[PDB]
A and B are shown apart, each in its own frame.
Chain A
Amino acid sequence: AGTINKPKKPTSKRKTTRLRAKISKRAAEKKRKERKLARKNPEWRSKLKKDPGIPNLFPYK
């Protein structure tokens, strides 16, 4: 593409405060839905987790 010779309109990185509140409200709303969905949790939880064990490259295995 001929971007160097004829660049197009820049994409502004100057954040508008309208987006920032709107961007923060969605982050808060999305976090709440995860906590609510994790409360319903129709999914099995166990006690002992899968321990990967000692790495093979450890010289004193």
Chain B
Amino acid sequence: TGWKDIPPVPTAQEFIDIVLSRTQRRLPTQIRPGFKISRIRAFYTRKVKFTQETC
């Protein structure tokens, strides 16, 4: 049929902005030092994992 359905390929800088904005706005961004250590570990683990899946 054709190859018009290929999604656009972002530039190197636009790729980073797309990935980093998604992990900032699609996930909560408020953690406090007074929480449990397991809760803090789970919060930052989610951010690292979420960034990779989008990538």
The reply to whether A and B meet directly (CB within 8 Å) is no
